[PDB]
Enzyme design. Structure first.
Site, PDB file in Angstrom:
ATOM      1  N   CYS A 134       0.819  -1.206   0.000  1.00 48.81           N
ATOM      2  CA  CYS A 134       0.000   0.000   0.000  1.00 48.81           C
ATOM      3  C   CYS A 134       0.853   1.257   0.000  1.00 48.81           C
ATOM      4  O   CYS A 134       0.379   2.315  -0.425  1.00 48.81           O
ATOM      5  CB  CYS A 134      -0.931   0.010   1.212  1.00 48.81           C
ATOM      6  SG  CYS A 134      -0.102   0.321   2.784  1.00 48.81           S
ATOM      7  N   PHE A 135       2.097   1.159   0.458  1.00 50.88           N
ATOM      8  CA  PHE A 135       3.082   2.215   0.295  1.00 50.88           C
ATOM      9  C   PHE A 135       4.044   1.904  -0.839  1.00 50.88           C
ATOM     10  O   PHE A 135       4.954   2.695  -1.102  1.00 50.88           O
ATOM     11  CB  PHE A 135       3.863   2.414   1.598  1.00 50.88           C
ATOM     12  CG  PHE A 135       2.993   2.675   2.793  1.00 50.88           C
ATOM     13  CD1 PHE A 135       2.137   3.763   2.816  1.00 50.88           C
ATOM     14  CD2 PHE A 135       3.029   1.834   3.892  1.00 50.88           C
ATOM     15  CE1 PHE A 135       1.335   4.009   3.912  1.00 50.88           C
ATOM     16  CE2 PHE A 135       2.225   2.072   4.991  1.00 50.88           C
ATOM     17  CZ  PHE A 135       1.377   3.165   5.000  1.00 50.88           C
TER      18      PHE A 135
END
EC number: 2.3.2.26
Lengths: 127, 446
Positions: A104-105
């Site tokens: 997600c990052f």
């Protein structure tokens, strides 16, 4: 009969192997604790250039969680909080553990592996 | 007794003269019909077999045998066949014997000139005799014959030498012979198994010698593409690899050989080929790998092999057109981490076509409106069977002009894969974290 594929390979079977512009990824990489001329980073780029298209795709899935190539290029790579560039972080834990990903990052934590061969083996074992 | 032995001898003299025009298949059908009389058959066969043994003026037949050498087929001084003509007399006699197997003579012959299961032992001895043992053709014909007839210890040694020495069809007929013999007696089964194992062990010993030279020469090549001359005797069509694999395929066909000094040095040899940065360089050991996975991985050690040589066994499979699930390497279907994606994709597509090979696939029309394709397709197809779906779809858009059906299908698939993620169908929603992926919409109960 489908169970012969991995969870990666079924995606690569349905949507096909992408062509990865390693130059676009390199142009959209952020280095946090490594630097762009660190030897482990030159080993990283040598390894990723040496991987075939399928192992490259498995890497892209490993760090981004998908094989999908952005139409506009990796400059438009999205994360949880808007456009997030790919990013390599040095994992200061012991170097007998694999790199780890937080998709997600689009975040890679990478131990400071002592050699090209060992780093390549560990990365290939991760993907 | 339709015909006497002098008329049979006059017919049989036609087997010696090699004339292309002469219809020898018709002569074979004459001898076949005559050989329905049991006493005629028995005398005919005893004469033909005496012709083979003696191969290993009215009778002035000049056959062109070699350059500047026109031999007389008969030397009468007690009648001998000049060894230059012998291979042709053998070839015509084995041609006749193959039909009779589907279904004194010399003294009579000079009197002219002056004006199944028992002889199987002779035909197996015949393999030792030089004009036959030389000629791959005569060996193939004699083996086809034995393979028909089959429906002692030296005779099996001579049958096995046909595999340990130099014909793929003739050696597959030798495999058939050795099987159909083994069907006879447990004692001949056992003796032929043990003598196959003995020959395979000899072949393995000399194969370990050859690979030991190969590995040593790769050491001397690196320590300072691959055309090591030691490789020639592995590339060779008649290489001990092909003999060893052939013999092992027969052993494994009879089961329904301890050589770790070979297998571990095949191991380190493969490892030193892979470290030597050449790829097809492995393939000179493909049949030894296939032998390894035949003798091992019985219908483990092969798994440690497939781990330590994984990318090598993948190079093997990727180069081979042998279909993964019909060749020897089928066992690894279930240990799937040991293959490349595109190898698994090829196996996938071949197994899919094999399983659905009985199904004829047709072309099938699909009439849709450009603005309704998704729901028109749902109505048309959602009750269709899987095998009707497996037909090749061509899509017609209402009132639109004709176009390439392949491009129109690709567009159709593209539009559908888009409309899948239209929120109006509530099928898929983006991960709130990633925002580019898609998972089942938990709001599809609407």
């Amino acid at each position: 009969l489908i169970s012969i594929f991995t969870e990666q390979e079924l995606e690569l079977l349905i949507s096909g192997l992408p062509t990865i512009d390693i130059d676009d990824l390199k142009s959209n990489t952020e280095y946090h604790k490594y630097q762009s001329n660190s030897i482990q980073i030159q080993w990283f780029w040598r390894a990723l250039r040496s991987f075939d298209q399928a192992d490259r795709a498995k890497f892209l899935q490993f760090v981004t969680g998908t094989s999908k190539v952005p139409l506009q290029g990796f400059a438009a790579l999205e994360g949880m909080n808007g456009i997030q560039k790919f990013q390599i972080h040095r994992d200061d834990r012991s170097t007998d553990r694999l790199p780890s990903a937080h998709t997600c990052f689009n975040q890679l934590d990478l131990p400071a592996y002592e050699s090209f061969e060992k780093l390549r083996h560990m990365l290939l074992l991760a993907i | 007794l339709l015909l006497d032995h002098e008329a049979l001898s006059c017919l049989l003299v036609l087997l010696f003269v090699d004339e292309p025009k002469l219809n020898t298949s018709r002569l074979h059908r004459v001898l076949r019909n005559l050989c329905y009389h049991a006493q005629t058959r028995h005398w005919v066969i005893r004469s033909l077999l005496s012709i083979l043994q003696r191969s290993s003026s009215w009778l002035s037949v000049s056959m062109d045998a070699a350059l500047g050498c026109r031999t007389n087929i008969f030397q009468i001084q007690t009648v001998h066949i000049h060894p230059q003509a012998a291979p042709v007399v053998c070839r015509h006699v084995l041609d006749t014997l193959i039909q009779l197997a589907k279904v004194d003579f010399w003294d009579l012959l000079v009197k002219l000139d002056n004006m199944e299961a028992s002889p199987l032992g002779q035909l197996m001895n015949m393999l030792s005799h030089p004009v036959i043992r030389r000629s791959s053709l005569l060996t193939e014909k004699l083996l086809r014959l034995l393979s028909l007839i089959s429906i002692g210890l030296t005779e099996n040694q001579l049958q096995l030498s046909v595999e340990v020495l130099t014909s793929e069809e003739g050696l597959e007929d030798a495999a058939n012979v050795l099987l159909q013999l083994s069907r006879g007696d447990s004692g001949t089964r056992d003796t032929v198994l043990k003598l196959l194992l003995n020959g395979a062990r000899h072949l393995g010993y000399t194969l370990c010698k050859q690979i030991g030279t190969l590995l040593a020469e790769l050491r001397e090549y690196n320590l300072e593409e691959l055309q090591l001359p030691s490789m020639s005797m592995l590339t060779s069509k008649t290489s001990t690899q092909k003999f060893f694999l052939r013999v092992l395929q027969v052993i494994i066909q009879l089961r329904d050989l301890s050589l770790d000094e070979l297998w571990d040095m095949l191991g380190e040899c493969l490892k030193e080929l892979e470290e030597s940065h050449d790829q097809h360089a492995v393939l000179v050991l493909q049949p030894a790998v296939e032998a390894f996975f035949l003798v091992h991985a019985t219908e483990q050690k092969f798994l440690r092999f497939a781990e330590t040589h994984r990318t090598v066994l993948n190079q093997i499979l990727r180069q081979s057109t042998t279909h993964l699930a019909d060749g020897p390497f089928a066992v690894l279907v279930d240990y799937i981490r040991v293959l490349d994606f595109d190898v698994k994709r090829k196996y996938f597509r071949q197994e899919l076509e094999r399983l659905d090979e009985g199904l004829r696939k047709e072309d099938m029309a699909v009439h849709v409106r450009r603005d309704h394709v998704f729901e028109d397709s749902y109505r048309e197809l959602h009750r269709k069977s899987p095998e009707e779906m497996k037909n090749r779809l061509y899509i017609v858009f209402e009132g639109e002009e004709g176009q390439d059906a392949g491009g129109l299908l690709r567009e159709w698939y593209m539009i559908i894969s888009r409309e899948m993620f239209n929120p109006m169908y509530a099928l898929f929603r983006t991960s709130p974290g990633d925002r580019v992926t898609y998972t089942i919409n938990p709001s599809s109960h609407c």
